[PDB]
Structure formats: structure tokens, C-alpha cells
Copies of this chain bind each other. A is one copy, B any other.
Amino acid sequence: SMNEIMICAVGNVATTPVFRDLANGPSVRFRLAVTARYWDREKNAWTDGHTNFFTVWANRQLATNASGSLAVGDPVVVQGRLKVRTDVREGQSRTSADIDAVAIGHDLARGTA
């Protein structure tokens, strides 16, 4: 394969993951919230910037393992292929971002193992 766009996204599980057994095998999907932060001089702390939302998809053993491990609020690191999609929702054409995950882990920077 060529010219896939890889992404690594560090964020929080934003929806309860959904597991489905398909003919092609196990599948899991969840929403991931990735919030950029910037250092404020006027407040002397980190302040939230833009939040990117992604729909994260996993398959095979990653799906099976994720289905037992991930819950809303969990800080995670996700690596995978970015897919920018256009679809109709509430009768409007809208662009959205999917990550076809290759690796997912609970982020040790923001929680214990």
C-alpha cells in the first residue's frame, strides 16, 4: 500500500465503545476526543484549545481486547490510519474523521496501568 495517512492521537474515550461481531470478525468503535492545550501567561496554567473528535475503529484481536478494556473518560493513545469522510447527517452534508486503529493503549501519562 502507499500514501496512507498515519496519525497518532492522544485523547479521551468520549463514548461507550460498541462491539459488533461481523462476518468479517470482531469490530469495535468509539468516539475519541483530542484536546489541544496552550500555556497561558495571563493565567499561569494550561488552557484548552480546539477539540478534534474522531471515530476510532478496531478489528480482530485489538477489537476483542478493547471491548473489555475501554470506558468513557479513559485517557488513551491511538495510532492508525486517518480517513476523512463526507456523509449526510440531520439532512446536511458534513465532514468527519475516522481512525482505523492499529494500536491503542491506556495512556500512562494521565493514569495508572
Contact surface of A with B, Cβ cutoff 8 Å: 1-11, 34-39, 46, 49-50, 52-54, 58, 61-62, 65-66, 68-69, 76-77, 79, 82-86, 93-97, 101-113
Q: Secondary structure at chain A's binding surface: helix, strand, loop or mixed?
A: strand
Q: How far is the CB of A94 from chain B (nearest CB, A)?
A: 5
Per a CB cutoff under 8 Å, which of B34, B62, B83, B96 touches A3? B34
Contact A108/B52 with A77-B103, A95-B97 known, Cβ cut-off 8 Å: no
B54 pairs with A2, CB closer than 8 A: no
B52 pairs with A112, CB closer than 8 A: no
B109 pairs with A10, CB closer than 8 A: no
